[model samples]
Target: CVATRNSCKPPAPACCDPCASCYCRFFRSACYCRVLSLNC
Candidate 1:
């Protein structure tokens, strides 16, 4: 999604919730997905 000019696509559900991913992408290097991983 970051690679696109503005339009972005959602990621796989196993990897992330689309909304969470989008929020992180819009922000800085913070990894909102850590909640899904062991290193939140």
Candidate 2:
């Protein structure tokens, strides 16, 4: 779990492809998403 100076609220569910990965930033507690790519 991440702790922040600002109150961190639970992130809402994301409606994206199964290949897409989602997470929240520790500092800002903001939601973000990314997808896998062939390039490294």
Candidate 3:
């Protein structure tokens, strides 16, 4: 699941959480936060 703007930010700290993923869009050096409940 992609995190909402209020829920995440560049170099997202949520990625440190279990099942979280740090995904970056093209041309962006920093990554956003996403979660993988299935993977967990």
RMSD of each: 7.6, 9.2, 5.2
What TM-score fits each model?
Answer: 0.17, 0.29, 0.29
Task: Please state the error at residue 2 of candidate 2 in Å.
Answer: 23
Residue 20 Cα positional deviation in candidate 2, in Å, after optimal superposition: 0.3
lDDT of 3 by residue, 1-40 (tens): 3452324554545566556766555475545565536656
Candidate 1 worst ten-residue window by lDDT: 1-10
Candidate 1 to truth, TM:
0.17
Q: 36, model 2: CA deviation in Å?
A: 2.5
Tens-digit lDDT track for model 2 on 1-40? 2222223223423324443345455566554553334352
Worst 10 residues of 3 by lDDT: 1-10
lDDT of 1 by residue, 1-40 (tens): 2321233224643224333332244455444332233343
- Where model 1 places Cα greater than 4 Å from the true spot, the runs are 1-10, 14-16, 22-40
Which candidate model has the greater lDDT, 2 or 3? 3
Q: Candidate 1 local accuracy as lDDT?
A: 0.35
**Backbone clashes, candidate 2:** 0
Candidate 2, residue 10: lDDT: 31
**lDDT for each of the candidates?**
0.35, 0.39, 0.52
Q: What's the lDDT for residue 20 in model 1?
A: 37
